[PDB]
Amino acid sequence: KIEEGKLVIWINGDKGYNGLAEVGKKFEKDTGIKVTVEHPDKLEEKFPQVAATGDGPDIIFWAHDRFGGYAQSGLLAEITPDKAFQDKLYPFTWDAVRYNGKLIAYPIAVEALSLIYNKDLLPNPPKTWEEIPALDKELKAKGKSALMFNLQEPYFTWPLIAADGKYDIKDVGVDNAGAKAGLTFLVDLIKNKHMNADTDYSIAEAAFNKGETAMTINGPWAWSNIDTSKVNYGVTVLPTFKGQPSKPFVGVLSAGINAASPNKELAKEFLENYLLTDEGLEAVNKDKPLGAVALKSYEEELAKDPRIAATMENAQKGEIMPNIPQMSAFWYAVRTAVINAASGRQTVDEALKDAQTN
């Protein structure tokens, strides 16, 4: 069961959980109410498991795409911000957190992937995906590689897969010919030894932050570990594919309140009056950047950072994630397809056909 008279918060391990804890400390220093921030592994799969029987945190943070499935299973409290609180955020951000016409979470920030590059190895980053093989050959001759990014999570490969362009994957529309073209290009990068099928988030981060690879693909949360690393880096528009922009699926980091929480009023106070303020968001943001924040007063400041202008540019070229209850199934089918194609276990056509079936 959930303890009454305290707050338990789950947020992903890549996000600013220490900064959020500091917002917990301000909460407690002035209400007496203790806030515990946790970042469990696979939190987005645990939450629906534990919440279904009335367990779990009082507040969960994730991109909005999983929140629909949670709202459909009755796991999220309808939130009750008054009309004046709602006017503190950009009006469109509320749509990412509406499900069946009801508000089921607070939007925090728009996150989009960008190309991040080492300006000392690569003063002029490539404009196209297609030219990456030739660039990699050049850099390999000096003991470096062109590009490493997480190939294990389909979020990172989607921008390429989605770039070009019944064939739905779990009720998400996909351009069949375009997804084949993107994913074949990615399989060919691997066959030709420009990337490794086993690269994951840590490997790609350590290679970039150690100056071993010229480029990575990541979100705003990644920038503070690069700052620490002293790599002279830039954040820029993703490369084009077949002359078309890469199209990332864009998530809105959002905060939902557990429907089984006995602390709904406290969670609401914490969220509206401590986190969603300049001071609150600035605390989380200095730990790991949030992206383009939903709070008009604070986004107004951040938006002059060229890294954020890059984040915004890539967002304009991509597509907000659907939040249909099928999204969890959708991501798993894509993930399986990319991994099986990239390892050579299946052809592209077989992997995509399997994802499109049932």
Epitope: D87, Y90, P91, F92, T93, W94, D95, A96, R98, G101, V110, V250, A292, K296, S297, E299, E300, A303, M312, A315, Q316, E319, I320
Partner: antibody, heavy 119, light 108 residues
Framework: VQLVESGGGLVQPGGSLRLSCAAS????????IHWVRQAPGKGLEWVAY????????SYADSVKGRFTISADTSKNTAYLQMNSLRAEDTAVYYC?????????????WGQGTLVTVSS | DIQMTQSPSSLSASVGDRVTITCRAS??????VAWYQQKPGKAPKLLIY???SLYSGVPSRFSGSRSGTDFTLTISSLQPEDFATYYC?????????FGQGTKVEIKR
């Protein structure tokens, strides 16, 4: 890329009209459709918008309770049902769109359709 | 509802002149302000979004800037084809609101 309005024309006062805006060449399911109107010799007046994503709708005070905005994502078409029409509603009506992202402008606009309300 | 006030409501300027149209928001909107040009008989066309982003394809003589709550549309070198009504628009709040328009004519 296009937004094509239809359904305007002469209507009696107190009467009704349904305006259509048929879209193509952009992601309709994540766009917002807006109706913006312009009375003879006056400026632009935003009247209504709908989120394709969430179905959320909202209205200018001047039309609330008489106009209904809707959208059928499966035919990429949005609608403005105009009831209890008044002389004050005479205008060229434009449909326009914004994409999902909150920092955009109204990038795509229809050609406009003239609504005249008189006997 | 947010009122957007443009100054001046009308101006006359020579070809090659630099033209400035200003828009003052009734309360504080955030850089969420777009500028449009409307020829008479025709749909408005977006010029600038997010206060200072030049919409794709628009000639680089058009630029937008912000100073606090004052939004500025600048035409660095006015062309005979630029006569129109220009409108600012805010999208920080719903209802979306438009300025009243500034009519630009060419002085000759």
């Amino acid at each position: 890329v296009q937004l094509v309005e239809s359904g305007g024309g002469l209507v009696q006062p107190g009467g009704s009209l349904r305006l259509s805006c048929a879209a193509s060449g952009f992601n309709f399911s994540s766009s917002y459709i807006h109706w913006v109107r312009q009375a003879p010799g006056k400026g632009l007046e935003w009247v209504a918008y709908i989120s394709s994503y969430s179905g959320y709708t909202s209205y200018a005070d001047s039309v609330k309770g008489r106009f209904t905005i809707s959208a059928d994502t499966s035919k990429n078409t949005a609608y403005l049902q105009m009831n209890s029409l008044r002389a004050e509603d005479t205008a060229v009506y434009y449909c326009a769109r914004t994409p999902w992202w909150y920092w955009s402008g109204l990038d795509y606009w229809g050609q406009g359709t003239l609504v005249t309300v008189s006997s | 509802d947010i009122q957007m006030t443009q100054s001046p409501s009308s101006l006359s300027a020579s070809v090659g002149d630099r033209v400035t149209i200003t828009c003052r928001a009734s309360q504080s909107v955030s850089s969420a302000v777009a500028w449009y040009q409307q020829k008479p008989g025709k749909a408005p066309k977006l010029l600038i979004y997010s206060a200072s982003s030049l919409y794709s394809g628009v000639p680089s003589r058009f630029s937008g800037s912000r100073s606090g709550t004052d939004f500025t549309l600048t035409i660095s070198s006015l062309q005979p084809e630029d006569f129109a009504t220009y409108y600012c628009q805010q999208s920080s709040y719903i209802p979306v609101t438009f300025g009243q328009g500034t009519k630009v004519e060419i002085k000759r």
